[PDB]
Design a protein around this motif. Structure first.
Motif, PDB file in Angstrom:
ATOM      1  N   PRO A   1       0.820  -1.215   0.000  1.00 24.96           N
ATOM      2  CA  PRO A   1       0.000   0.000   0.000  1.00 24.96           C
ATOM      3  C   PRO A   1       0.850   1.260   0.000  1.00 24.96           C
ATOM      4  O   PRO A   1       1.921   1.315   0.608  1.00 24.96           O
TER       5      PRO A   1
ATOM      6  N   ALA B   1       3.645   2.406   2.816  1.00 29.36           N
ATOM      7  CA  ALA B   1       2.977   2.245   4.100  1.00 29.36           C
ATOM      8  C   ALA B   1       3.572   1.072   4.866  1.00 29.36           C
ATOM      9  O   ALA B   1       3.499  -0.075   4.415  1.00 29.36           O
ATOM     10  N   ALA B   2       4.164   1.362   6.021  1.00 32.17           N
ATOM     11  CA  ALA B   2       4.654   0.311   6.894  1.00 32.17           C
ATOM     12  C   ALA B   2       3.481  -0.404   7.561  1.00 32.17           C
ATOM     13  O   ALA B   2       2.341   0.068   7.560  1.00 32.17           O
ATOM     14  N   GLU B   3       3.773  -1.566   8.134  1.00 27.96           N
ATOM     15  CA  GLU B   3       2.732  -2.379   8.743  1.00 27.96           C
ATOM     16  C   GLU B   3       2.281  -1.787  10.070  1.00 27.96           C
ATOM     17  O   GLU B   3       3.099  -1.534  10.958  1.00 27.96           O
ATOM     18  N   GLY B   4       0.976  -1.579  10.208  1.00 29.75           N
ATOM     19  CA  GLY B   4       0.402  -1.130  11.455  1.00 29.75           C
ATOM     20  C   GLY B   4       0.152   0.355  11.562  1.00 29.75           C
ATOM     21  O   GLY B   4      -0.396   0.799  12.579  1.00 29.75           O
ATOM     22  N   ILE B   5       0.538   1.142  10.560  1.00 29.19           N
ATOM     23  CA  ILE B   5       0.245   2.567  10.595  1.00 29.19           C
ATOM     24  C   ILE B   5      -1.230   2.789  10.284  1.00 29.19           C
ATOM     25  O   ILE B   5      -1.911   1.938   9.715  1.00 29.19           O
ATOM     26  N   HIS B   6      -1.735   3.949  10.686  1.00 31.45           N
ATOM     27  CA  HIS B   6      -3.141   4.265  10.493  1.00 31.45           C
ATOM     28  C   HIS B   6      -3.271   5.756  10.242  1.00 31.45           C
ATOM     29  O   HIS B   6      -2.370   6.534  10.562  1.00 31.45           O
ATOM     30  N   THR B   7      -4.405   6.142   9.659  1.00 32.33           N
ATOM     31  CA  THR B   7      -4.640   7.541   9.324  1.00 32.33           C
ATOM     32  C   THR B   7      -4.775   8.384  10.585  1.00 32.33           C
ATOM     33  O   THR B   7      -5.547   8.051  11.489  1.00 32.33           O
ATOM     34  N   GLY B   8      -4.014   9.472  10.644  1.00 31.82           N
ATOM     35  CA  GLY B   8      -3.966  10.321  11.810  1.00 31.82           C
ATOM     36  C   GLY B   8      -2.743  10.129  12.676  1.00 31.82           C
ATOM     37  O   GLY B   8      -2.556  10.892  13.631  1.00 31.82           O
TER      38      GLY B   8
ATOM     39  N   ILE C   1       7.314   2.389  14.845  1.00 29.77           N
ATOM     40  CA  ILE C   1       6.986   1.878  13.520  1.00 29.77           C
ATOM     41  C   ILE C   1       6.429   3.011  12.671  1.00 29.77           C
ATOM     42  O   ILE C   1       5.395   3.606  12.999  1.00 29.77           O
TER      43      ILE C   1
ATOM     44  N   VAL D   1      -5.465  -5.074  -1.200  1.00 30.65           N
ATOM     45  CA  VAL D   1      -4.515  -5.928  -0.488  1.00 30.65           C
ATOM     46  C   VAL D   1      -3.493  -5.085   0.271  1.00 30.65           C
ATOM     47  O   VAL D   1      -2.877  -4.160  -0.275  1.00 30.65           O
TER      48      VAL D   1
ATOM     49  N   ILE E   1      -4.509  -3.189   2.830  1.00 25.00           N
ATOM     50  CA  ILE E   1      -5.260  -2.075   3.394  1.00 25.00           C
ATOM     51  C   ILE E   1      -6.493  -2.629   4.093  1.00 25.00           C
ATOM     52  O   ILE E   1      -7.245  -3.410   3.499  1.00 25.00           O
TER      53      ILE E   1
ATOM     54  N   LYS F   1     -11.113   5.369   9.988  1.00 30.45           N
ATOM     55  CA  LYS F   1      -9.678   5.361  10.266  1.00 30.45           C
ATOM     56  C   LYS F   1      -9.050   4.185   9.533  1.00 30.45           C
ATOM     57  O   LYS F   1      -9.134   3.039   9.980  1.00 30.45           O
ATOM     58  N   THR F   2      -8.397   4.473   8.413  1.00 29.59           N
ATOM     59  CA  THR F   2      -7.866   3.428   7.552  1.00 29.59           C
ATOM     60  C   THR F   2      -6.501   2.982   8.065  1.00 29.59           C
ATOM     61  O   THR F   2      -5.650   3.817   8.389  1.00 29.59           O
ATOM     62  N   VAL F   3      -6.293   1.669   8.140  1.00 29.22           N
ATOM     63  CA  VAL F   3      -5.092   1.095   8.728  1.00 29.22           C
ATOM     64  C   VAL F   3      -4.395   0.239   7.674  1.00 29.22           C
ATOM     65  O   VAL F   3      -5.031  -0.320   6.774  1.00 29.22           O
ATOM     66  N   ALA F   4      -3.065   0.203   7.737  1.00 31.85           N
ATOM     67  CA  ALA F   4      -2.258  -0.612   6.833  1.00 31.85           C
ATOM     68  C   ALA F   4      -1.973  -1.932   7.529  1.00 31.85           C
ATOM     69  O   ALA F   4      -1.107  -2.015   8.402  1.00 31.85           O
ATOM     70  N   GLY F   5      -2.702  -2.976   7.137  1.00 37.08           N
ATOM     71  CA  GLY F   5      -2.596  -4.267   7.757  1.00 37.08           C
ATOM     72  C   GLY F   5      -1.921  -5.285   6.863  1.00 37.08           C
ATOM     73  O   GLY F   5      -1.223  -4.949   5.898  1.00 37.08           O
TER      74      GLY F   5
ATOM     75  N   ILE G   1      10.561  -4.001  17.974  1.00 38.94           N
ATOM     76  CA  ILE G   1      10.773  -2.564  17.835  1.00 38.94           C
ATOM     77  C   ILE G   1      10.527  -1.847  19.159  1.00 38.94           C
ATOM     78  O   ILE G   1      11.302  -0.964  19.541  1.00 38.94           O
TER      79      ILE G   1
END
Ligand SMILES: [Mg+2]
Ligand SMILES: [Mg+2]
Ligand SMILES: [Mg+2]
Ligand SMILES: [Mg+2]
Ligand SMILES: [Mg+2]
Ligand SMILES: [Mg+2]
Ligand SMILES: [Mg+2]
Ligand SMILES: [Mg+2]
Ligand SMILES: [Mg+2]
Ligand SMILES: [Mg+2]
Ligand SMILES: [Mg+2]
Ligand SMILES: [Mg+2]
Ligand SMILES: [Mg+2]
Ligand SMILES: [Mg+2]
Ligand SMILES: [Mg+2]
Ligand SMILES: [Mg+2]
Ligand SMILES: [Mg+2]
Ligand SMILES: [Mg+2]
Ligand SMILES: [Mg+2]
Ligand SMILES: [Mg+2]
Ligand SMILES: [Mg+2]
Ligand SMILES: [Mg+2]
Ligand SMILES: [Mg+2]
Ligand SMILES: [Mg+2]
Ligand SMILES: [Mg+2]
Ligand SMILES: [Mg+2]
Ligand SMILES: [Mg+2]
Ligand SMILES: [Mg+2]
Ligand SMILES: [Mg+2]
Ligand SMILES: [Mg+2]
Ligand SMILES: [Mg+2]
Ligand SMILES: [Mg+2]
Ligand SMILES: [Mg+2]
Ligand SMILES: [Mg+2]
Ligand SMILES: [Mg+2]
Ligand SMILES: [Mg+2]
Ligand SMILES: [Mg+2]
Ligand SMILES: [Mg+2]
Ligand SMILES: [Mg+2]
Ligand SMILES: [Mg+2]
Ligand SMILES: [Mg+2]
Ligand SMILES: [Mg+2]
Ligand SMILES: [Mg+2]
Ligand SMILES: [Mg+2]
Ligand SMILES: [Mg+2]
Ligand SMILES: [Mg+2]
Ligand SMILES: [Mg+2]
Ligand SMILES: [Zn+2]
Lengths: 120, 50, 114, 91, 69
Positions: free
Chosen positions: B5, B26-33, B46, D51, D53, D61-65, D82
RNA sequence: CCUGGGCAGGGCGAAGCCAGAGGAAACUCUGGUGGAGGUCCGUAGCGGUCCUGACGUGCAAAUCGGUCGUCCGACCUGGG
RNA sequence: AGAACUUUGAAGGCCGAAGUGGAGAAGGGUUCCAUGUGAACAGCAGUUGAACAUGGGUCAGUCGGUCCUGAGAGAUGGGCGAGCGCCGUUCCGAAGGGACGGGCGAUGGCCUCCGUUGCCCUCGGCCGAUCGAAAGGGAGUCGGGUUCAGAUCCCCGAAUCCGGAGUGGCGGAGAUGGGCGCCGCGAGGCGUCCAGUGCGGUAACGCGACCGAUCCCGGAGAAGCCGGCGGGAGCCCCGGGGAGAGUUCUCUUUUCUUUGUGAAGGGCAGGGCGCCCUGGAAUGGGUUCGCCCCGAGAGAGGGGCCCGUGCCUUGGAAAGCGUCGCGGUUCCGGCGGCGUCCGGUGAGCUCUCGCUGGCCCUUGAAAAUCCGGGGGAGAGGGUGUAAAUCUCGCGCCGGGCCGUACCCAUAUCCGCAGCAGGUCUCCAAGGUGAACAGCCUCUGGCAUGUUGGAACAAUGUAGGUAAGGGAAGUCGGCAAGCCGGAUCCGUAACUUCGGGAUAAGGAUUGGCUCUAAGGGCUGGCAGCCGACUUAGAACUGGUGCGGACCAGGGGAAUCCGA
């Protein structure tokens, strides 16, 4: 055309041999279910908004109409009458028992008042 | 043509009054905001490129 | 039973050839053209989607006709935010500014006591 | 009523492309078509976007999964590493 | 076109210049008064023939009047 | 590659959902709803299996009549 | 002069709304229309034609090109190349010639007041000149009539867009209030000071207008496919009325054609809202065909906004249509009467709008244009006097260029041709019928497709039969023929458990009377109105019923390719 349409309205020329398509093609099962369940779900609204059914049994009979149990409006109305006649007995017996228990508790409180007056 | 993504991360120009819009992977686990930080002494989480 | 006919030479059913049919006063079904539908403006980049209320949803070349009543709302951030964004950004700006004042006076007390 | 006993969601395909391949596609089709509990609004409205997303229905709230699940086990391991290297002796 | 509701507003329109056509159309239940001033057509409809006659009396005589049959 | 147009009706009934019954639990059984698909019969469309049919100095320097395969798509098609 | 063929009357047919119908894009270029001839052309013929000769015909601010970019094509800077030239489109470029504001000098008009010139200061990423769609984006014209040929272009009538306003065209906003001392019974007046870049609703937001510069942000433009459902329109159906016509051997309050409101502005239905306020649920509740929604606020009550292609109103009945009658040789978009009405319903077909869901290692286009918001540099009369600005109601002027005929096809295109070939589109009625299947009709077209008359020989090309046998013919069941639709039963071997399956194999199917079931709307259970579906019973026709058309022969196996 008008004579043939009048014969179809009477119910003639509609045998087994003059059906050239499937029953789902002639009268669809989805359309039959839509008509059936719209009628069986707005009769409950006409009952609930006016007088008949309360808030809690409305949702139970709503789910039981959503399930394929109640065939049509007549036996739906008969089942509502049966639940109403059962609820009337279940509230009459409860009100009689509550009246007996309330008079017993009132008599016990008045005997407590009599013993309080005898002590003081 | 990409299964990863894309992330539209808007910035702020330190020199002129204008918001700069960039396109990160887009890294894994980021979200809008989420406040994505970037720089040398950025704290290690992250999404924070450093 | 009266099969009707195009009026331009746009012979294909494209998006610009979006039509309807009406009835003339001279008792004839005519094939009358329809402007494409205009959508109302939405909010700004991050809230739940929904068209802003009180704006004449037309084409932007039709927005030259419109006066300064049917294009915005009298509130600040009127024709850009759906006012839920306004009542959130006001509280967010106020709370973040007050907490930065609290952090600044905490640093001032650290300066005075260290 | 339980109409299918083994194919499950894969019965939309039918007789084609092998029992083992259909069995291996079954679990990830359930994983991509199951709604997930949102960690932000608390609802279960995680609708699948393209895929990589994921998208919760409420609060947008859209997340990158992950590609087929909401969280990869490798991604949880990376997140734990981390945060461990974060709070390990302050960099 | 536009429909003037007030008799005073219609007579103000008749007093206003840049107007070259006033038409009177009798009808089976009312009467319609037309002013073609400039690119707009203004109509006063009224259901009283006595009011139509007194409006014809109060009409300014400097402008031509066309009676539709 | 870009930009547009089109695909009549029926059959099978996936996920999800509802109701009833059984069980201690795991869960199971039944009746509905749902409309999934490089799915089935089939039209327009696209190709051309067979009659090795008709023609075969022809309608035609490759066409026609039946019988055809597919027709929500790995589908057909205009223009740049 | 001449008729199997030209024209008209009549009769019988075909195409039968997926057309042999009405118009388009590409292509043709005068083929479109009228008049005249018929040696030449049309495979015979012509009095006929797309032949020939003469003369006509295409009218646009609001239809399209022109504007914009898409895939892509491209010149300069640069590089290469013996060389015409080539590579490349942001790369290695000093690749913005523009405006605001201030100051200074000069010119002109009625030098009051304004408009320019020249210099200085300040500001200002082009994703890089330019091209690239007659189906993409793209502001705004609709109704009647007119010709032998035009039509949203011409005439009449009714509207809209885009530019223009210097001595700034007229109104309305901004706009005119409050306090103080005095006079006057009072209405009011005198003089001073101050405010006034609009108001209301708790709100969602509303109004006749609402100061805005560099700059910044955002929206529109700007979105895939397929299911469902609901609203609106058009067409179709039924009952009553009004006008005309058909049949009447007998019957039929029968049958057929028609029964109107365009763009634009206002009002009101209808649809939708992830839009607000009060208010807090659990005995969980509200709603869908399906879902879905609820403490991040459900039900309920009260409001707000958007589309309003629906109805009414100005347009608008004066036109248009039907029918009856009357004058002008004719010229007259003639003259007069009446009507152009009441309702109901839909698994009805098409278009449009809206809600919601599914699909994906497919996320389903940019640019030109236009709008809103944040910012307050600046601007303006300063008070009994009116501006800085107006996205408000009006008033005036202009909108240049190019194309507009016709065929759009079993006869105007291509294929050497009036060639069973090929070529991209919109509109689509009635019956039977599941169906835009097949068949018969209506609106609309046509002469059977480059010939007619006589007879029905062989052979042929298409179609149908045939006593008994049923593949014995043939390399091969090649061809042809059987089952075929629907309803009720019942379905194997095998298997990847999905299938195999419409497996296999049986019964019914016509007509006419009935019976039962499936709804809506009013009143505090009673009454009125329509829907085509299913099931069952009797009677009857020469076992006849998918009566035409529509239309799976089946089973057991082997090899190969999932
Ligand atoms: Mg079903
Ligand atoms: Mg276009
Ligand atoms: Mg298939
Ligand atoms: Mg099969
Ligand atoms: Mg087959
Ligand atoms: Mg063939
Ligand atoms: Mg052959
Ligand atoms: Mg021969
Ligand atoms: Mg076929
Ligand atoms: Mg076939
Ligand atoms: Mg098939
Ligand atoms: Mg006939
Ligand atoms: Mg069609
Ligand atoms: Mg056609
Ligand atoms: Mg001609
Ligand atoms: Mg002649
Ligand atoms: Mg000849
Ligand atoms: Mg010639
Ligand atoms: Mg004009
Ligand atoms: Mg080049
Ligand atoms: Mg050079
Ligand atoms: Mg261009
Ligand atoms: Mg245009
Ligand atoms: Mg014409
Ligand atoms: Mg017109
Ligand atoms: Mg619909
Ligand atoms: Mg309707
Ligand atoms: Mg209107
Ligand atoms: Mg034309
Ligand atoms: Mg031909
Ligand atoms: Mg053809
Ligand atoms: Mg040839
Ligand atoms: Mg029909
Ligand atoms: Mg039918
Ligand atoms: Mg002939
Ligand atoms: Mg021919
Ligand atoms: Mg025989
Ligand atoms: Mg025999
Ligand atoms: Mg036998
Ligand atoms: Mg044998
Ligand atoms: Mg042999
Ligand atoms: Mg055969
Ligand atoms: Mg036979
Ligand atoms: Mg066996
Ligand atoms: Mg089999
Ligand atoms: Mg073997
Ligand atoms: Mg194969
Ligand atoms: Zn969420």
């Amino acid at each position: 055309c008008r004579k043939n349409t009048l014969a179809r309205r009477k119910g003639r020329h509609m045998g087994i041999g003059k059906r050239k398509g499937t029953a789902n093609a002639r009268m669809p099962e989805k359309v039959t279910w839509m008509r059936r369940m719209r009628i069986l779900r707005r009769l409950l609204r006409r009952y609930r908004e006016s007088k008949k059914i309360d808030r809690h049994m409305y949702h139970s009979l709503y789910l039981k109409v959503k399930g394929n149990v109640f065939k049509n409006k007549r036996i739906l109305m008969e089942h509502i009458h049966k639940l109403k006649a059962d609820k009337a007995r279940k509230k009459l017996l409860a009100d009689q028992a509550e009246a007996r228990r309330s008079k017993t508790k009132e008599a016990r409180k008045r005997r407590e008042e009599r013993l309080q007056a005898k002590k003081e | 043509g990409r299964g990863a993504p894309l992330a539209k991360v808007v910035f702020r120009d330190p020199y002129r009054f204008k918001k700069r819009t960039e396109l990160f992977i887009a890294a894994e686990g980021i979200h809008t905001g989420q406040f994505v930080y970037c720089g040398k002494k950025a704290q290690l989480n992250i999404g924070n490129v450093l | 039973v009266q099969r009707l006919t195009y009026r331009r030479r746009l012979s294909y059913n494209t998006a610009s050839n979006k039509t309807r049919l009406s009835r003339t006063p001279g008792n004839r079904i005519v094939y009358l053209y329809t402007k494409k539908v205009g959508k109302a403006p939405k909010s700004a980049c991050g809230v739940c989607p929904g068209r802003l209320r009180g704006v004449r949803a037309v084409r932007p070349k039709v927005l030259m006709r419109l006066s300064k009543t049917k294009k915005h709302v009298s509130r600040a951030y009127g024709g850009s935010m759906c006012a839920k964004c306004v009542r959130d950004r006001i509280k967010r700006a106020f709370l973040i500014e007050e907490q930065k004042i609290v952090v600044k006076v905490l640093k001032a007390q650290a300066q005075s006591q260290k | 009523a339980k109409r299918t006993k083994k194919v499950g969601i894969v019965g939309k395909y039918g007789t084609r492309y092998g029992a083992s391949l259909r069995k291996m596609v079954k679990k990830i089709e359930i994983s991509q078509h199951a709604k997930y509990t949102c960690s932000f609004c608390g609802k279960t409205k995680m609708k699948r976007r393209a895929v990589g997303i994921w998208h919760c229905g409420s609060c947008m709230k859209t997340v990158a999964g992950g590609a087929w699940t909401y969280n990869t086990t490798s991604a949880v391991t990376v997140k734990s590493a981390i945060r461990r290297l974060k709070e390990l002796k302050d960099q | 076109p536009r429909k003037i509701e007030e008799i005073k507003d219609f007579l103000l329109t008749a007093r206003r210049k840049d107007a070259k056509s006033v038409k009177i159309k009798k009808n089976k239940d009312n009467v319609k008064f037309k002013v073609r001033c400039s690119r707009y057509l203004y109509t006063l409809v009224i259901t009283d023939k006595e009011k139509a006659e007194k409006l014809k009396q109060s009409l300014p005589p400097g402008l031509a009047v066309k009676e539709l049959k």
